Amino acid sequence: VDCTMYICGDSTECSNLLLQYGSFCTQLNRALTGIAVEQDKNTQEVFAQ
Amino acid sequence: VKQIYKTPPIKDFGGFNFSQILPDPSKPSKRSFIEDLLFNKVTLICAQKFNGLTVLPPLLTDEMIAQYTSALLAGTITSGWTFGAGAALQIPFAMQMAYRFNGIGVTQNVLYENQKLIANQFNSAIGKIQDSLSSTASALGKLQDVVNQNAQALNTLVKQLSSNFGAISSVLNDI
Amino acid sequence: SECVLGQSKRVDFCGKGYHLMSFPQSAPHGVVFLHVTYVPAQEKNFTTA
Amino acid sequence: SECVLGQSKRVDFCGKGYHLMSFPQSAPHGVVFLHVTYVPAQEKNFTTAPAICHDGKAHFPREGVFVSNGTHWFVTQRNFYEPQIITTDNTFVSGNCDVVIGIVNNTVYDPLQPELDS
Amino acid sequence: VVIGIVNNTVYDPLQPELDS
Amino acid sequence: SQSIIAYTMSLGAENSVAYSNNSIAIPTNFTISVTTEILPVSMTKTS
Ligand SMILES: *[C@@H]1O[C@H](CO)[C@@H](O)[C@H](O)[C@H]1NC(C)=O
Ligand SMILES: *[C@@H]1O[C@H](CO)[C@@H](O)[C@H](O)[C@H]1NC(C)=O
Ligand SMILES: *[C@@H]1O[C@H](CO)[C@@H](O)[C@H](O)[C@H]1NC(C)=O
Ligand SMILES: *[C@@H]1O[C@H](CO)[C@@H](O)[C@H](O)[C@H]1NC(C)=O
Numbered sequence: 426v427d428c429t430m431y432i433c434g435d436s437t438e439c440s441n442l443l444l445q446y447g448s449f450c451t452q453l454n455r456a457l458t459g460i461a462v463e464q465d466k467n468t469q470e471v472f473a474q
Numbered sequence: 475v476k477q478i479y480k481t482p483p484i485k486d487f488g489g490f491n492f493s494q495i496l497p498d499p500s501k502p503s504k505r506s507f508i509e510d511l512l513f514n515k516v517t518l519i520c521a522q523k524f525n526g527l528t529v530l531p532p533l534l535t536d537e538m539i540a541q542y543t544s545a546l547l548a549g550t551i552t553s554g555w556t557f558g559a560g561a562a563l564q565i566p567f568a569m570q571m572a573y574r575f576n577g578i579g580v581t582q583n584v585l586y587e588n589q590k591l592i593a594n595q596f597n598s599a600i601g602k603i604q605d606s607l608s609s610t611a612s613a614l615g616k617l618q619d620v621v622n623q624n625a626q627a628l629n630t631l632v633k634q635l636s637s638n639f640g641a642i643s644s645v646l647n648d649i
Numbered sequence: 650s651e652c653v654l655g656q657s658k659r660v661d662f663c664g665k666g667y668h669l670m671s672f673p674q675s676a677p678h679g680v681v682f683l684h685v686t687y688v689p690a691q692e693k694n695f696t697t698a
Numbered sequence: 699s700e701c702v703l704g705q706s707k708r709v710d711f712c713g714k715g716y717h718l719m720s721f722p723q724s725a726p727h728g729v730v731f732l733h734v735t736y737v738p739a740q741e742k743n744f745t746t747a748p749a750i751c752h753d754g755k756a757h758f759p760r761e762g763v764f765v766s767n768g769t770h771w772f773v774t775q776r777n778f779y780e781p782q783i784i785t786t787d788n789t790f791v792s793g794n795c796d797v798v799i800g801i802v803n804n805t806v807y808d809p810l811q812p813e814l815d816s
Numbered sequence: 817v818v819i820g821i822v823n824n825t826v827y828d829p830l831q832p833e834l835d836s
Numbered sequence: 837s838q839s840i841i842a843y844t845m846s847l848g849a850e851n852s853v854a855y856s857n858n859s860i861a862i863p864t865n866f867t868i869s870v871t872t873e874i875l876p877v878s879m880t881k882t883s
Contacts, residue, residue: 442640445637445638445639445640445641446637446639446640447630447633447634447636447637447639448630448633448634448637451630452630474661475848476848476849477848477849477850477851478847478848478849478850478851479851479852479853480850480852481855482852482854482855482856484855484856486856486857487857488799488857495672495674495683505675506674508674508681508683509674509675509676512674512675512676512677512681513676513677516676516677517677536675536677538847539675540675541847542675542847543673543674543675545847545848546653546673547672547673548852548853550653550654550670550672551855552853552855553853555654555655555656555709556738556861557654557853558650558653558654558655558709558710558715559654559655559709559710559714559715559716559737559738560715560716560737560738560739560863561737561738561739561741561861561863562851562853563738563741563743563860563861563862563863564743564853564854564855564856564859564860564861565776565860565861566746566855566856566857566858566859566860568748568800568857569746569748569763569860571669572748573776574656574669574670577656578656578667578668578669578687579667580687581758581790581792582748582758582759583756583758583790583792583793586748586749586756586758586793586797586798587793587797587798589799596685599685600672600683600685603683614676616679617676617677617678617679620678620679621677621678650708650709650710650711651708651709651711654709654710655708655709658707698820698821698822698824713871714869714871718868725874727876727877727878727879727880728874728875728876728877729873729874729875729877730872730873730874731871731872731873731874731875732870732872733870733871733872733873734868734870734871735868735869735870735871736866736868737866737867737868737869738863738866738867739863739865739866739867740863740864740865741861741863741864742861742862742863742864743859743860743861743862744859744860744862745858745859745860746858746859746860747858763860763862765860765862774862776860776862777862777863778862778863778864778866779862779863779864800857800858810830810833814833814836815836816836
């Protein structure tokens with residue numbers, strides 16, 4: 426999920442305002458990427474033996 | 475393990491070399507030869523003091539963990555698995571290898587004839603870990619990644635104070 | 650408990666292949682296992698019955 | 699599934715040391731297990747040898763170990779004190795005595811001799 | 817009963833010492 | 837004169853077992869103990 430797009434989208438005023446919330450979007454994106462990588466990790470561990 | 479076992483200085487293991495794993499008094503610390511490389515490779519460190527952050531030292535210091543590891547090592551060497559189930563009944567390593575060969579499904583003879591080559595192969599394999607760890611920085615991946623994740627999470631938490639969250643300013647005193 | 654204080658009857662739990670023993674090694678915020686296993690080599694094409 | 703439904707060979711999982719059996723007990727939002735262990739005691743150590751040489755061929759204890767009280771040698775299971783005379787019925791042979799290191803010269807009794815009378 | 821059983825001689829360790 | 841002390845916790849007892857290539861220790865009188873284990877199963881079904 427794109428945090429900036431989901432919260433604001435194409436609008437620019439909302440995107441500018443959201444910068445006041447620090448790096449919550451970055452943290453959420455990092456967590457989602459970690460989960461996505463972990464999915465492939467589990468798939469490989471279970472199947473690629 | 476409830477007791478701290480030790481290896482007699484003779485260390486007559488019939489060609490099996492435990493220098494890499496057993497404690498090394500030569501170094502300032504009592505940790506084994508391999509341990510030093512692992513700690514050096516593993517080691518935003520000691521730079522979190524502001525904003526009320528504090529770190530509690532672990533209950534079991536590194537020296538205590540090394541002592542526990544050395545005790546487990548000594549128990550495994552002489553007593554094999556016997557000390558993990560009762561009294562530490564010492565058995566020669568040359569014959570402990572034969573006893574284990576029986577568990578997997580190999581007769582004690584194979585070892586009783588090939589002991590020299592078996593010990594040489596064991597020493598080479600255990601001794602080759604040093605070079606592999608030294609030449610490869612990804613061998614300690616898990617600990618490095620978890621430490622980096624914790625460090626970056628703490629850094630992000632600290633930096634969050636720099637965001638006003640829609641307020642006029644990010645400093646209470648200025649407001 | 651299993652790899653060090655005994656011989657693990659499981660498979661691919663203590664090292665690769667048949668387990669023999671494991672010599673524990675400590676590490677910062679972790680532990681390193683020197684798994685020792687048995688690996689056959691030099692297979693042949695003998696006949697059975 | 700392992701401690702109660704059967705016997706577990708896992709170490710310090712179904713009980714401290716060699717596991718024997720377990721008896722589950724009901725508890726509020728919990729389980730109380732009365733594990734039964736088997737811990738050897740009354741230690742005693744003797745002299746040993748890897749193999750035994752009788753007539754130029756190396757003998758091995760098969761399912762036991764070579765021990766001795768200083769007067770008589772015996773073959774017994776490593777996990778208990780059950781001495782027995784070195785006999786082919788509990789001993790197997792492979793290879794010569796030269797290759798083996800630490801081999802101790804001794805005589806292997808033949809259980810056939812008592813039956814070879816008359 | 818066995819399937820694939822092969823025929824080969826089997827030695828008796830007690831044959832040389834059978835005589836009393 | 838009971839008080840509170842601040843010491844370095846002992847890492848268990850110290851027992852160095854004599855080890856030689858010609859010596860083996862074999863038990864003679866086994867003992868049986870009972871190891872109690874406790875493990876929670878579920879929480880209260882609060883809603
Ligand atoms: C073993 O023999 C089979 C047939 O007898 C053959 O197909 C196979 O390639 C052989 N493998 C080796 C390693 O000799
Ligand atoms: C080993 O034997 C010696 C005597 O040879 C004895 O003093 C010692 O207590 C024994 N230790 C064990 C663990 O049996
Ligand atoms: C055991 O050690 C002694 C001296 O420490 C040595 O003389 C002896 O040969 C060793 N045992 C074997 C089987 O080599
Ligand atoms: C083994 O395979 C060969 C070739 O197909 C066949 O002639 C033979 O009967 C088979 N024997 C058994 C015991 O399956």
